[PDB]
Amino acid sequence: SGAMYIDCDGIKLNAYLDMPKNNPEKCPLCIIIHGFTGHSEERHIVAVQETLNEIGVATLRADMYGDHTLFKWLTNILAVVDYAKKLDFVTDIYMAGHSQGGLSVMLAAAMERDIIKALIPLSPAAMIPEIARTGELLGLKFDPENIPDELDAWDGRKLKGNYVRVAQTIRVEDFVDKYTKPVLIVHGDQDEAVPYEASVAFSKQYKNCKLVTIPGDTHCYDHHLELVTEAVKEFMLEQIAK
Template sequence: MSDYLARELTAPVAATADHPGGLVHALVYVPRAVVAGGGRAPLVVCCHGLGESGLRVAPVAQRLAAAGAVAIAPSFRGGGAPTAGPTTEMTIRTEAADLQAVLAVARTWPFVDAARTALFGRSQGGLVAMLEAAAHPAQIAALALWYPALAAPASVRRRFGRIDAVPASFAYRVDEHDLTLGRAFARDLWDLEVEDRMRGYRAPVLIVHGEQDADVPIAVSEAAVRTLPDARLVRVPGAAHGFGDANFETAVTRTIAFLTWAGVLDD
């Protein structure tokens, strides 16, 4: 028997002038001890990467639930899940809106200690988590990021040169296959100054990054720890983009230890 119960969540996302609304679906893992004994547990929302779904970060969420957190793995709209909608409508802002919708619902649950909320993110999910924490620093007690795509805005600007050169749709290489993205994806990244956002987030941040990552070079995370007021970098020798087997175990163990040290998880 696992140490947690698995549930599903559907949260409404309001439409804006630039983006349609909809529903974001998520996997939820609740520690059995909380269900059986009452009390409140910390909350950790896990953000997946580009072209993925919540299933990609579910193993991390399950480990966090076993460590005592209510852990949620959303499937961002347009991210890659079958019910998530077209990828051409997905942007960094729609993913941020999805994350905010999930957080808003989860914070109302009586078994959640909202004061101990942390975010986990891998690759583009790391950028989404970073931006959410920077926008609401008092609400996010800690961040744990794996090879975060913090240089995505600069990468898009280098690729196209100017915003009016971005086509209506374009291919973006992800894990050896092409994902079709829309002009709105580039538009919402274009003017983002991630370093300026990071400077305002003063809670603890852990970044775990493979030294052989060709998709997001480790130099991106090295620059981030110099910018963030309270950050530490764990280098994983020989690891590329994405952790498997022993590298996954190293990363998730360090993540749990960090969130315990930061006061999110119980010791």
């Protein structure tokens, strides 16, 4: 049905609501949260969105922001959840996200563990908190105890130190331990941005996680996006059948 915005704390979160083509009275919905540098219309997100719509699952692609921090993003994602809970057509709510959106939905799904029926982290950037505690962020090295006011960051973006100050506090493993419902992690084994082996490890820690490895592929699935969508389709058909 199209572009929309969700009000949160005096800012507006841009989103898109897409229904399955038959316009069902009642259907499940998947929240899809792109990453920090990305956008909802990007190929790797749209492909997943179209795939879900095709199997009868509505989608709500959303920005997790309108000084970015994981506290702001998580706050915004709770607003998106709260919006989705009010939609009359919705049966069950699912969550998917890519890269820093993947980390964010890993966190938010635990916070929403009673509501979110299954979780799909796509190449989640889930090591950020630990790396921030070592005093690294991309090519920068600082004393983890003396954080710079400004950090030159992802895709040229300038972040405040508050990003790190907040990130350092997040114990990802606590949120993994608390989400015991089904998870599908997808990750390319030639990912140059986020190490594949991180997803291996997080897959073993979750109680109920399937890891799907995209052989040869990059962070945004430049080579085999279709293997991503096939895995998501198979997993989500399994879940909507329960």
